[PDB]
Design a protein around this ligand. Sequence first.
Ligand SMILES: CCc1c(C(=O)Nc2ccc(F)c(S(=O)(=O)N3CCOCC3)c2)[nH]c(C)c1C(C)=O
Length: 125
Amino acid sequence: MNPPPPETSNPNKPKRQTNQLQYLLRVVLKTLWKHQFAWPFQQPVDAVKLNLPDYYKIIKTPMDMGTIKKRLENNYYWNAQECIQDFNTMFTNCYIYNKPGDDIVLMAEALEKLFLQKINELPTE
Ligand SMILES: CCc1c(C(=O)Nc2ccc(F)c(S(=O)(=O)N3CCOCC3)c2)[nH]c(C)c1C(C)=O
């Protein structure tokens, strides 16, 4: 079966607004979210629905842009690097589970390239 999705809230964890976090939501995440190849990454992998019973045997640190979006929207991240790390985990997972030439790998590559292009313009903190 599926695990519960990653937490999108931490109670009593303090909260802040920063230019970097705003940029991560309204520029980086927004741009990736709207890309033609975003759809496979907009929610947790549903291994039951997609019939991938080994997925969560292999991937022990799941991440997706749906989770990242909700973390940003709920001020779950204090440091920009926490968010950048989540993006990195998402892409890495795709290369762990899938093979060269797979459609999902081509899509992750395109999204990762776009991610790098937008993170290049991240404001200073
Ligand atoms: C290859 C499986 C996979 C996906 C993926 O999502 N495949 C997918 C297949 C069929 C679909 F229909 C949709 S869907 O986006 O349209 N969809 C999801 C929400 O419910 C409605 C339908 C998505 N994503 C990742 C990271 C991986 C792997 C194994 O790495």
